[PDB]
Design a protein around this ligand. Structure first.
Ligand code: NDP
Ligand code: NDP
Ligand code: KBK
Ligand code: KBK
Ligand code: MG
Ligand code: MG
Lengths: 410, 410
């Protein structure tokens, strides 16, 4: 019986996490939701609290901690440990009652809970990709110290890849570890992309796209930031780096392929040239579930895949001219050092600027290129505590520099 | 270092088997070809003998045993054990020097060597599907006695399925064993089909197709019998039953899907509804290699898959009206008992009759239906020796009855 915490429960991933847990529990109860944790949204956390009755509840924002303790008074015969800020986060990671922790907090901020989840030797079902991009070697170093901790990828493409693996080999190693690809006989990765809503546009049309065109008609509603990254393909850019770290695959062995129906979620070519891929409808229910039940699988009543209903599956290379964020991500990843940190930090700004209609589409890649060009490699700190500080200083600097380039231009 | 015998070496599978062995050995020598075995074709066996220098050589046909011993005299410093008939076959299966045996003999006749390979506790890389159709429960019974013997499927779709499996689970069991699908969390199988050359024909055009239209433009040259079965889709019919036996999957959980580009070789849906599939270009080099290196994989220099070059992959249900052999195969398999034996035996005849332009296309299914309709279930023999005899008597009877229906109609 699997004890699970959901970090970022009110968001897209968190909501989807509880949905599949709920649905699986109907068939046979095997999950216990032990904790939930959010930033600002008090009401919805309360609603989730009544449904799942988690032993722990927590909220980052101090100033709604009163406004919440209050609301949880209405549940009868229910006394939860109710906590606040990073301190609550740390306490939940400490609990000897929680086995597995889902990381559905967005952006750079997801790194802190991921960091502590590892420190506490937990299974970490990680959807937050920014943490891996900004801090992969830090996470590697940290996973090396804490032998029993594990990152199980929830990002759908990375879930797919992980599912294509013979667990006979995976079990001899773990994600984000040198030699993962050699132990798993991995030769190369096809990293599938939906292509986003802007895929068939001319350069001219592209120049003019807006924040609004990007958010429109979600297959399922994702957080605003990933949705924008999907649209610039910076999301695939980030996922390239994430692949390199998770599975120790060289950048030259990672191929981005646009596959608009999103049925094949990614493919692994093995050293004999046999390719294995994972398929399902565009959905996060399966990656989340698998990360919670690995190395096993359990029954669900999800809609079965129907290949004849899908009928056609297509594959084409992305245009680097239309989607330059991809190139930038490869450049940054191949240079290594802290360039991924800079890539990620400057995108966060340019993503928000475009989101709030502050900048045009090609200004996104323009900002990110200028910031990367302005960065200079630093000696990688030796101990974990110093490395973290260094990551933080570089992250804030790249953010400031991005804001700065925008300011110095209107 | 892997010691391999190739049964049916001069045929399509046997030739392809040695090709991949040769090519893999160039990269790093890991295979030793220990034996080769054929029916009638003396010259080519000799040629293979000079290339591979196998410790044993054998030929079924007694009357070319002289004509061969003669030819092998020309190789210098090379003294092979040269054998004949079933007796040679048995001796090779006995050898303590041979680990793994590839079964590339066609038709019902492949059952004998498969039978003895199992009896001798060998790894059996089995491409011959007819043996599984005619004798699955006999093979199951036999694999139960001989714990260390294993059928590793070489049939590409079955190879694909086997490759989609977590070897962590496979290793707890083996192919052709009750509960295989439960231990592997298998819910259902998409069994892919090329569809054959007749796929877009109208009923009228279909009625008129010839033996010649069927053999035309092989992607790679296959034996005449499988090629014809491919064309009627009786080949997929047989593979449905083969799937049921190999992986203990219910017939209602096996779906035939026409996928003309033949890149996805088959898919496995697991109990959580996640689907895994294996992909490559239409080729037998990979299934053969995998069956020889399982549970491991090794390097090859095969042409890598290029999804953007493939571009489109399509899936549609087959027409039972155009391809009634498929229905007949499901009917026979679901009835069980010895109906698969009858299905297989009567097809062999109707396949040959069509091949030699003796009958029309729909006469194939007509003959096979009449034979099945005429059969009556028998109590399944209790001991292995009696079961075998019973399989043999039913096989010959269905053949005679098929010939007979044809005779009584011109
Ligand atoms: N959405 C998706 O299908 C996918 C998402 N991902 C990744 O997963 C992560 C989650 O993204 P997504 O769910 O889309 O984003 P959302 O905006 O939908 O959700 C963010 C969640 O994190 C919470 N959060 C923000 N800050 C904190 C904090 N400091 N402490 C605790 N919780 C916090 C939010 O809380 P609050 O509600 O209180 O504001 C909310 O619950 C991202 O990194 C994304 O890249 C990866 C693949 C697919
Ligand atoms: N061809 C393919 O790509 C595929 C084949 N298969 C299966 O594999 C099996 C082999 O088919 P395929 O290679 O096409 O057929 P072929 O006709 O090309 O080859 C048959 C081989 O078996 C040999 N043979 C026949 N009788 C005997 C015997 N009594 N003793 C020893 N050898 C014998 C033949 O010898 P000889 O040359 O002397 O006549 C020849 O070497 C079939 O059951 C088929 O269904 C499955 C999937 C794909
Ligand atoms: C319509 O369905 C999809 C839309 C977008 C995406 C991808 O973004 C979200 C993501 O990383 N997932 C699901 O792992 P993509 O980066 O391929 O556009 C994947 C599927
Ligand atoms: C053009 O490539 C192909 C032609 C035919 C087939 C199949 O027949 C041969 C076979 O069983 N294999 C390869 O496992 P199918 O039964 O799908 O027509 C598979 C691929
Ligand atoms: Mg993703
Ligand atoms: Mg086949």
């Amino acid at each position: 019986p699997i004890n699970v915490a959901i970090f970022g429960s009110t968001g897209s991933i968190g909501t989807n996490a509880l949905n599949i847990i709920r649905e699986c529990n109907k068939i046979e109860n095997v999950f216990n939701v032990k904790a939930l944790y959010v930033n600002k949204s008090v009401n919805e956390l309360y609603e989730q609290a009544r449904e799942f009755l988690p032993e722990y509840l927590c909220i980052h924002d101090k100033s709604v901690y009163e406004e919440l303790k209050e609301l949880v008074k209405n549940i009868k015969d229910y006394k939860p440990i109710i906590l606040c800020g990073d301190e609550g986060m740390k306490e939940i990671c400490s609990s000897n009652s929680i086995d597995k922790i889902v990381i559905g907090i967005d952006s750079f901020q997801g790194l802190y809970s991921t960091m502590y989840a590892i420190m506490n030797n937990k299974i970490v079902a990680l959807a937050n990709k920014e943490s891996i991009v900004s801090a992969g070697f830090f996470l590697k170093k940290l996973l090396n110290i804490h032998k029993n901790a594990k990152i199980i990828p929830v990002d759908s493409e990375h879930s797919a890849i992980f599912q294509c693996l013979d667990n006979n080999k995976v079990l001899k190693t773990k994600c984000l570890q040198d030699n993962f690809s050699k132990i798993n006989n991995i030769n190369k990765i096809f990293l599938c992309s939906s292509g986003g809503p802007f895929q068939n546009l001319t350069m001219d049309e592209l120049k003019n796209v807006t924040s609004e065109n990007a958010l429109k008609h979600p297959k399922w509603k994702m957080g605003k930031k990933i949705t924008i990254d999907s649209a610039t393909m910076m999301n695939k850019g980030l996922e390239v780096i994430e692949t390199h770290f998770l599975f120790d695959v060289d950048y030259n062995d990672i191929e981005v392929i646009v596959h608009k129906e999103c049925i094949i979620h990614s493919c692994v070519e093995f050293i004999d040239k046999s390719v294995i891929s994972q398929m399902y409808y565009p959905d996060m229910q399966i990656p989340i579930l698998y990360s919670l039940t690995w190395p096993d699988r359990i029954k669900t009543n999800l809609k079965p895949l129907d290949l004849a209903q899908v009928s056609t599956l297509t594959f084409h290379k992305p245009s680097l001219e239309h989607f330059p964020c991809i190139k930038l991500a490869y450049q940054a990843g191949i240079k290594g050092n802290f360039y991924p940190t800079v890539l990620n930090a400057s995108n966060e700004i340019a993503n928000n600027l475009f989101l709030n209609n502050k900048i045009k589409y090609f200004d996104i890649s323009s900002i990110i290129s200028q910031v990367l060009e302005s960065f200079n490699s630093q000696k990688v700190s030796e101990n974990s505590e110093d490395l973290m500080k260094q990551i933080l200083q570089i992250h804030s600097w790249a953010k400031d520099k991005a804001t700065d380039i925008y300011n110095k231009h209107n």
